[PDB]
């Protein structure tokens, strides 16, 4: 229903790996996310195209002085994605532009640790990872509003991933069409 995979032994392997929690977010919290979140975003354009860049067609910032009702949302993530593993001074709100969309890549395993957790927001889009080592290895996660992604262990690590653009936009065979999406995402220390 939200995940799929190239095969039986992805899946089983990656079952508390990467992991997706829809409806993670209430319509009253993903309102209080994007509310807080639009002022700062239009403050800046839909930033210039670098061909190699693994981001196109967005905007972002880095937030870490939060409302108390965002603050206690992040809590929430924290609380159910991390562990005792420490939190990053500040969080990752990335805006992708309806034709912008993300590139195969892993996180940086010098600045980032061993979690990375995404609520997704506006809009439906589907996270692509493949096996680095192995092309024949991936899974497909659908990505809605509200949605919260956590990728972790050897998805983190041993997987790419990437949200797919427009015109790629399928979850098996369904087209899932891309708009605007706002990411909040938190990271782990080294
Ligand atoms: O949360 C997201 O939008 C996906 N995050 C990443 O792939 C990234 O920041 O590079
Ligand atoms: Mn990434």
Avoid: N
Avoid at 46 to 73: L, M, N, P, Q, V
Wanted: proline share 5%; charged share 30%.
């Amino acid at each position: 229903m939200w995940v799929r995979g190239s095969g039986p032994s992805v899946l089983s392997r990656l079952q508390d790996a990467a992991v997706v929690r829809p409806g993670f977010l209430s319509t009253a919290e993903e309102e209080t996310l994007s509310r807080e979140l639009e002022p700062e975003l239009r403050r800046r354009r839909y930033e210039y195209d670098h061909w190699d860049a693994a981001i196109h067609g967005f905007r972002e910032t880095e937030k870490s002085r939060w409302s108390e009702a965002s603050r206690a949302i992040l809590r929430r993530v924290q609380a159910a994605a991390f562990g005792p593993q420490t939190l990053l001074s500040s969080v990752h709100v990335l805006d992708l532009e309806a034709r912008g969309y993300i590139k195969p890549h892993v996180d940086s395993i010098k600045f980032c640790g061993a979690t990375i957790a995404g609520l997704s927001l506006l809009s439906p889009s589907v996270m692509r990872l493949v096996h680095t080592q192995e092309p024949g290895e991936w899974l497909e996660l659908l990505l809605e509003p509200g949605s919260l992604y956590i990728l972790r262990g050897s998805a983190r690590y041993d997987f790419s991933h990437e949200i797919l653009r427009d015109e790629e936009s399928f979850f098996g065979e369904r087209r899932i069409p891309r708009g605007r999406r706002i990411s909040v995402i938190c990271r782990s220390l080294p």
